[PDB]
Write a protein that binds this ligand. Sequence first.
Ligand SMILES: NC(=O)c1ccc[n+]([C@@H]2O[C@H](COP(=O)([O-])OP(=O)(O)OC[C@H]3O[C@@H](n4cnc5c(N)ncnc54)[C@H](OP(=O)(O)O)[C@@H]3O)[C@@H](O)[C@H]2O)c1
Ligand SMILES: NC(=O)c1ccc[n+]([C@@H]2O[C@H](COP(=O)([O-])OP(=O)(O)OC[C@H]3O[C@@H](n4cnc5c(N)ncnc54)[C@H](OP(=O)(O)O)[C@@H]3O)[C@@H](O)[C@H]2O)c1
Ligand SMILES: NC(=O)c1ccc[n+]([C@@H]2O[C@H](COP(=O)([O-])OP(=O)(O)OC[C@H]3O[C@@H](n4cnc5c(N)ncnc54)[C@H](OP(=O)(O)O)[C@@H]3O)[C@@H](O)[C@H]2O)c1
Ligand SMILES: NC(=O)c1ccc[n+]([C@@H]2O[C@H](COP(=O)([O-])OP(=O)(O)OC[C@H]3O[C@@H](n4cnc5c(N)ncnc54)[C@H](OP(=O)(O)O)[C@@H]3O)[C@@H](O)[C@H]2O)c1
Lengths: 249, 249, 249, 249
Amino acid sequence: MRAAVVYKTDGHVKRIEEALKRLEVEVELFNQPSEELENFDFIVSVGGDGTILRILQKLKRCPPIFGINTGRVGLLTHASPENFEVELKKAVEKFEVERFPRVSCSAMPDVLALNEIAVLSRKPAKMIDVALRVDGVEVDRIRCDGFIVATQIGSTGYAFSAGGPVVEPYLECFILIPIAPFRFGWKPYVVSMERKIEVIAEKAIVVADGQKSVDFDGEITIEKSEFPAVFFKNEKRFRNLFGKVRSIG
Amino acid sequence: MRAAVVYKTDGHVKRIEEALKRLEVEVELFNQPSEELENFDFIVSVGGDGTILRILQKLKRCPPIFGINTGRVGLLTHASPENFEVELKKAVEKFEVERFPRVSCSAMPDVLALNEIAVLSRKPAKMIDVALRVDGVEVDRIRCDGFIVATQIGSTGYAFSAGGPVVEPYLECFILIPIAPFRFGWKPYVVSMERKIEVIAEKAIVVADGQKSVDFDGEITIEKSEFPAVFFKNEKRFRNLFGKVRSIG
Amino acid sequence: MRAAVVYKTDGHVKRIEEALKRLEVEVELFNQPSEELENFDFIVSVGGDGTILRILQKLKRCPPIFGINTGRVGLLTHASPENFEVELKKAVEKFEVERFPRVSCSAMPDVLALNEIAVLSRKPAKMIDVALRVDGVEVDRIRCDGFIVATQIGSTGYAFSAGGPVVEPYLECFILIPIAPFRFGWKPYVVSMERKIEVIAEKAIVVADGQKSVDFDGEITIEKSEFPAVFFKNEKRFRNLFGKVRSIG
Amino acid sequence: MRAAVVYKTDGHVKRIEEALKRLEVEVELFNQPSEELENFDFIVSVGGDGTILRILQKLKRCPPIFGINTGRVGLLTHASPENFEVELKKAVEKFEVERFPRVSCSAMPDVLALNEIAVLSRKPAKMIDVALRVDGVEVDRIRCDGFIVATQIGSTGYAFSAGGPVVEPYLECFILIPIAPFRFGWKPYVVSMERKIEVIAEKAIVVADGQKSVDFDGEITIEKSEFPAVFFKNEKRFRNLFGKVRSIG
Ligand SMILES: NC(=O)c1ccc[n+]([C@@H]2O[C@H](COP(=O)([O-])OP(=O)(O)OC[C@H]3O[C@@H](n4cnc5c(N)ncnc54)[C@H](OP(=O)(O)O)[C@@H]3O)[C@@H](O)[C@H]2O)c1
Ligand SMILES: NC(=O)c1ccc[n+]([C@@H]2O[C@H](COP(=O)([O-])OP(=O)(O)OC[C@H]3O[C@@H](n4cnc5c(N)ncnc54)[C@H](OP(=O)(O)O)[C@@H]3O)[C@@H](O)[C@H]2O)c1
Ligand SMILES: NC(=O)c1ccc[n+]([C@@H]2O[C@H](COP(=O)([O-])OP(=O)(O)OC[C@H]3O[C@@H](n4cnc5c(N)ncnc54)[C@H](OP(=O)(O)O)[C@@H]3O)[C@@H](O)[C@H]2O)c1
Ligand SMILES: NC(=O)c1ccc[n+]([C@@H]2O[C@H](COP(=O)([O-])OP(=O)(O)OC[C@H]3O[C@@H](n4cnc5c(N)ncnc54)[C@H](OP(=O)(O)O)[C@@H]3O)[C@@H](O)[C@H]2O)c1
């Protein structure tokens, strides 16, 4: 096997190299993500949740990712720098995998998002008027700072901050929620991920996973893609969800 | 075929009877639901969602229910008294059916809930300390007036009032949410309805769909039963959801 | 001077007695508060905020209260048992005083509330329809588990759990907020404590500071009384507020 | 007397000219605000709440404003185009006035805000780390899209959208509230307007009343100014608050 180790800072990189060596895995080192990372049997990510998002932006077909958390909460990670060698060994020897859907949006065809597509005002302190359709039906029209279309994995990201519910990783769905909605009443809406979401807004910017973005006007379609994020199975993922969420900051 | 008409007040009951009779259906009227409603091919309810919740509490096997909304929002109803005739003919002719899961709790194993199981302080104005586990993991413990375990169908009821999300009727899940939580941070949690929910509390009551209740002390488990609620297919269910929610009051 | 020591459990009571005695203060111990507490120059309470709420319910004219926190957050307390001695000496020597207004409601004209008057359904799990007027204007009508009329001091209690704002203790106002409102939009309202509040509801109870309650049907008026709560000046009150709130649980 | 009539569109301007003439008032017409508007006995504003904000940005000492609402809610306005002639006549003949505090911020010395100062990320979809101090005490540190320091008049603006309480116009205070706070728990804080607010944020933009703005880094002080907004007394202002708020969109 050949693995890619992608790191932001090189604190623990030597020990990771030595672990993968003891495991008879060939190692290539990267300090920035690239599409070349598709050419590996697996990817070791050193950093945080954000680091995994940036790696994912470079992958269409996704080799399984093992995350070592130096970041903070690490909802996407499998180990810390203190316990990684035991966890990495178990992960590669078992080689069990887990998949989470990513979505696309029509304003950025070849971009994929694990957390959310967000549609925001191009100018801060400026509202946009957002119309929401789902499978062709008009669901809402609200003036707001922006509007989030998140997966369940994204329920703990921006959607969370906007007031959304925590949804467990293994319940596939969309969370549709506004940021600073200027209306007396509003609610987050949770719908099946097999549906097609349409957002219409003038003078907007669309943003996938806080990374790639483009200005747009009018209609954008968001739908589940065929290219999921792939991670080594983290067998305590559901258990760890609720403690991690309560630590968010 | 034979139908039961269940009403609270004598609404358009003679008219509805006449419509069934022109469809070659035999009718029997019920001022109150009973277990006798199982001995019918289908059930027409005249009332609001609350009437339908009371029909269901008397049914294990559920003949498909057609709801005529005399109440308020009528998320469980199919028509108005000003248009029932046409949807009713359409329904019995096609006889297309739709099912939503019900849950039961161990404190009252024989009673089924479509909306939610709620665990409240036995004395109003007193908090209770509620511990929540899901498939055996301690997910939270929180001081509160009560705690709601709802289905997606129940996301528009008591859970909605506690601050929960609107979940579409075809996405199967539990919403777990406190009533007046005395804590700085809290979120509703949305989890798979395949999971087992455990609630532990002292000096408490348990209520199913607002209808049946009993005092309890200690652990109760809530889980998905084998006896879903059966309605005629409402083809506009998802598209109707949005305007009905905004009308909530 | 003579002081009353009121406690729930025999905490640091012998120690506290000894400290008062070295300040040339005479002491009498109270296992339960009574109207007899008016015949003292000051009152030391050993307990939490709840103990202080119970002292106050027995006082019209209020000797200044010094609180030793054995409970939880102790927004109404002055010290811990691990530091009471020093703040207590400091307090009796300077004898600087601080007052917060109390309110009364017409259902129980003789009982005063520092935190809030709460109007709840008499039966748990049942909503009540609450109409709210302020100086005679109909401000709202809403179906809910209950409705809270709090002072700024009460903004960190039941009102906080219902979703209310944190108001500093020196900004005099009412917070008006429902418990589990069954409606698409709602807000808490903050108004001048000089205004008269009218609540109308049937099949209800009214509760003052969590302590005294009575059944009522119809209109009640809540207004500012002439008998404020009197504590020794806590010089860190405002700065302490913020960390205590975040610790709420 | 000499009045300035400031309008966005000229639909009803002729009738306003004729009304002021019948009242023996000299009229000057403006289709954009300017500092020259200080030179008048009163100002008639035709447009909405936003129109009043833009006028106010050009005034240090403020002549009394009478607002004719063609906008939407009109919390700041006195009449509609259907009833203005009766209301204008009563307003000028009585000449009773009402004042609401405006605040300044140190990053824009000569700018005044009626609603709020908002401190936002310069880049959309980017959080800033905001530290909040009040009278020198550290109150909070939160990662967020932005942070609002509103007056009570602003409680129905951006602060409202971020989740803040409705505060009546005659209760002077600050509302301190984050936009999209990335934290498990948070609350709006309501404090006395006699206090000094300090916000510290890197890579921010500060915005007064959605109008004037400047990029800044580090510490900004917000405090009540000596230059209030002055309006003709609207004797139904408190009464109208609650209906207007429920109509917000
Ligand atoms: N809440 C907000 O107001 C806000 C605003 C914009 C974006 N975001 C989130 O940040 C993501 C991209 O970030 P960016 O480059 O703009 O900033 P970023 O610095 O990469 O991320 C900001 C924070 O979000 C955390 N995070 C990322 N995914 C998460 C997940 N799904 N659950 C819980 N926390 C998660 C990050 O974790 P680590 O520290 O471990 O890397 C970090 O603490 C977006 O996908 C969006 O979900 C949040
Ligand atoms: N929100 C609260 O503070 C609160 C408190 C107790 C109970 N409830 C809800 O009321 C239900 C029945 O309890 P009850 O007998 O005490 O009250 P109820 O009077 O029988 O019904 C309460 C109200 O909720 C509506 N409703 C019922 N199911 C709904 C659904 N899932 N989505 C949206 N609205 C729904 C009813 O509609 P109709 O007018 O058409 O009948 C009625 O107006 C419970 O299952 C619970 O969901 C809510
Ligand atoms: N949040 C809810 O769901 C709910 C329900 C009922 C009552 N309450 C609150 O409890 C108070 C007393 O009622 P009770 O006898 O039923 O309960 P309690 O057990 O006497 O007190 C309830 C809890 O609230 C705390 N508390 C009291 N006043 C507070 C204040 N203004 N700010 C922050 N925390 C405060 C107490 O602190 P200590 O631990 O230090 O004593 C205690 O932990 C009421 O006035 C009401 O404010 C809240
Ligand atoms: N809620 C949000 O996400 C958001 C975002 C940015 C700014 N704002 C608010 O808008 C103000 C400046 O606006 P801008 O030029 O960016 O946009 P704007 O177009 O002038 O105003 C946006 C909306 O806010 C309304 N409004 C202004 N002051 C209000 C008040 N205090 N109470 C209730 N509604 C009020 C306006 O009323 P009319 O239609 O009558 O003119 C308009 O409907 C700011 O002071 C801020 O309060 C809100």
